[PDB]
């Protein structure tokens, strides 16, 4: 495996990760307002 390659692969796509990580985290906080 190429860890030096892997970090460079994820370096360019960091925007895609951070665009939807916060959204997936935000998927909750409404079920919390809908539960007991």
């Amino acid at each position: 495996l190429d860890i030096r390659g892997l970090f460079r692969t994820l370096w360019a796509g960091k925007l895609w990760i951070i665009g939807m990580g916060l959204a997936f985290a935000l998927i909750a906080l409404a079920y919390t307002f809908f539960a007991r």
């Binding site: 892997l6 692969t9 994820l10 360019a12 796509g13 960091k14 895609w16 990760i17 951070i18 665009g19 939807m20 990580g21 916060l22 959204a23 997936f24 985290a25 998927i27 909750a28 906080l29 079920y31 919390t32 539960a35 007991r36």
Partner: protein, 36 residues
């Protein structure tokens, strides 16, 4: 009288959902790099 609520204790959900979101975003970015 209790002082704090037991469930759904938002903080744990926030943390774990965000962790899963970061992991899946990194995986999707890695797949997209090979998809382009």
């Amino acid at each position: 009288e209790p002082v704090k609520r037991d469930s759904p204790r938002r903080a744990f959900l926030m943390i774990m959902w965000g962790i899963v979101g970061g992991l899946i975003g990194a995986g999707v970015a890695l797949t997209r790099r090979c998809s382009k």
